[PDB]
Amino acid sequence: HTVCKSKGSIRNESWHIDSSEPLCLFKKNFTYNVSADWLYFHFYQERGVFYAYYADVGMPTTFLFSLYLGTILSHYYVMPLTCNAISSNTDNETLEY
Amino acid sequence: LSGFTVKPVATVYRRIPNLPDCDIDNWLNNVSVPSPLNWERRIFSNCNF
Amino acid sequence: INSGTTCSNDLLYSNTEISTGVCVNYDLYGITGQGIFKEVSAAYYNNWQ
Ligand SMILES: *[C@@H]1O[C@H](CO)[C@@H](O)[C@H](O)[C@H]1NC(C)=O
């Protein structure tokens, strides 16, 4: 699960537990417009390499990276957003993925 | 006839590093020097140096 | 040793200067070939290109 920064719940974000930093193949931060409206993302694997594309504004989609893993991923999921300002009594706002 | 097709020896290699730097010099040049009794340790992983 | 991800950078990619004018082998950005380099001033490139 994952919690929200602003108007957080009475819980804490805890989805993984590690006593040491594991070995990773890619780690880099990205920035986008805070005043955007709709975001688009593309993901696909082929010939053993995986791709990622992101877009914050406009019709096309920009490039992120091209990773080599040698395996074939099969599953994908979207963690829920536990918060308190996504209710009817709060401001009118819902979550769509 | 075929002329002289000798191939050069130089080679140019440019590629995205894909990983951030370790910044070991930034940690070794800190303004605060730890005492020999504390000897604060540092761990570096998933980075290039 | 010889494992993990924290590899070195001065092994073979010493970031040589662009020796424009002569024919040289290109092995950069995952593309092999040969050619001559020239110097221009372009502005159509983007951050992800
Ligand atoms: C990415 O942002 C997080 C949160 O601010 C930070 O802890 C991390 O060091 C950043 N990573 C890079 C590569 O800037």
Swiss-Prot record, chain A:
Disulfides per UniProt: 4-83
Protein name: Spike protein S1
Shown chain mapped onto the complete sequence: 160 to 256 of 1351
Function per UniProt: Attaches the virion to the cell membrane by interacting with host receptor, initiating the infection.
Positions annotated with a glycan in the UniProt record: 12, 29, 33, 92
Gene for this chain: S
Organism: Human coronavirus HKU1 (isolate N5)
